[PDB]
Design an enzyme around this catalytic site. Structure first.
Site: not given
Ligand SMILES: [Mn+2]
Length: 412
Positions: A129
């Site tokens: 991420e």
């Molecule tokens: Mn996010």
């Protein structure tokens, strides 16, 4: 030249968002209409249907139908579709997040006309991420392929987690300590436009903006919060739990609220390898990779609503967040309503707690200099269009870089 669309879902903590991109054989973006990105979103997120996983998957159908209507019909069966859930599902108790993902991939199988690989649907790691967003920002800024010292680092404040990610020297990589806990490793090795990078990346679960609120509210759980305004009481629900919260009759207090934000960070945790940020987490060295920061997501939304941050991005300083906090915490709940007319009604009570946390995270948490220049962003102007500063573009670049006979602009 070979062309390819990519459809990428970000299943965040408070909402779900589909991104559609189009790429040529070189992994240079192509237009869709006037734009370089088509994206729409819905609230609430997948985690809000923890009990009804079938209904979680159905929430995404509008989005899926919208995105399909954008990618030309003849191109559906060879257009990758991926979905990555992040900290919302990361906070669920386990059986439930997999049950949601199972519904989602059934729905994609049963209802999509696009290409669905066996890895299409997952809860992605915090480190991926962080990394994907790093790719996103540095691609968009053309700083990609350059020495690590000429690249931009990123801080993603989502609702449930915050990621720091910046490039680092072969050297600092070689000596990176083993992670503590319980905790993902500190380094991610990737190749981007023919050059190898060693990213420092960490994700702090529960230190997202909304999750951080809850930590703050819990330090006064019997009682009034100094981070909340006079006039204000409700029950606040987050991740399956209710909290009864209220402002003091004497009003918010910036300093007292600031103390709670510092306390939540556990800045005085033992630090098994120096230098630390908070919670005994190694900072990764803070070299030239991180001199320049693009700061996103919740650093953007409220700031831009009160107006001291400007679309699609703007140069700022961390103290900009302290001065907004002092201003917000100087007001009653009634007053906050009239003075901040562009803040969303259900976010308005948290302007004092949000900005003081945003500030103390940047400065005390990550050691940033209150007067150092940062950029705050929802988007970056790329060619003639705005493309959003979030992790999914990075993931689309990974997926299409691996089509046959395409440029492997990024991997690993
Ligand atoms: Mn996010």
């Amino acid at each position: 030249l070979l062309t390819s669309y990519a459809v990428i879902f970000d299943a965040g903590s408070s909402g779900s968002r589909v991104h559609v991109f189009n790429f040529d054989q070189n992994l240079d973006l192509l237009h869709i209409g006037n734009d370089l990105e088509f994206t729409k979103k819905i609230k609430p997120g997948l985690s809000s249907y923890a009990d009804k996983p079938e209904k979680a998957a159905e929430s995404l159908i509008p989005l899926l139908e919208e995105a399909e209507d954008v990618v030309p019909e003849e191109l559906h069966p060879k257009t990758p579709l991926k979905l990555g859930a992040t900290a919302g599902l990361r906070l669920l108790d386990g059986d439930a997040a997999e049950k949601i993902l199972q519904a989602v991939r059934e729905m994609f199988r049963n209802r999509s006309s696009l290409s669905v690989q066996p890895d299409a649907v997952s809860v992605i790691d915090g480190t991926q991420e962080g990394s994907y967003l790093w790719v996103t920002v540095n691609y968009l800024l053309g700083k990609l392929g350059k020495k690590f010292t000429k690249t931009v680092g990123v801080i993603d404040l989502g609702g449930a987690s915050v990621q720091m990610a910046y490039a680092v020297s072969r050297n600092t990589a070689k000596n990176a300590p083993k992670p503590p806990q319980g905790e993902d490793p500190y380094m991610k090795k990737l190749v981007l436009k023919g050059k190898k990078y060693d990213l420092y990346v960490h994700s702090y679960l529960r230190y997202g903006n909304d999750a951080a609120r809850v930590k703050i509210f819990k330090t006064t759980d019997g009682a009034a919060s100094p981070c909340l305004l006079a006039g204000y009481e409700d029950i606040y629900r987050y991740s399956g739990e209710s909290y009864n919260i209220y402002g003091p009759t004497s009003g918010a207090n910036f300093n007292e609220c600031r103390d709670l934000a510092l306390q939540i960070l556990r800045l005085n945790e033992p630090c098994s390898h120096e230098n630390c940020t908070f919670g005994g987490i190694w900072d990764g060295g803070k070299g030239s990779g991180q001199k320049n920061l693009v700061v996103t997501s919740a650093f953007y939304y409220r700031s831009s609503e009160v107006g001291f941050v400007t679309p699609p991005n703007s140069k700022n300083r961390p103290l900009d967040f302290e001065t907004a906090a002092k201003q917000a915490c100087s007001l009653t709940f009634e007053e906050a309503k009239s003075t901040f007319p562009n803040v969303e009604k259900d976010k308005l009570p948290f302007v004092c707690v949000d900005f003081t946390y945003q500030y103390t995270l940047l400065v005390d948490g990550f050691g940033l200099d209150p007067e150092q220049e940062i950029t705050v962003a929802e988007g970056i102007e790329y060619q003639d269009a705005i493309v959003e500063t979030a992790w999914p573009l990075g993931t689309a670049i990974e997926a299409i870089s691996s089509l046959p006979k395409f440029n492997r602009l990024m991997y690993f």
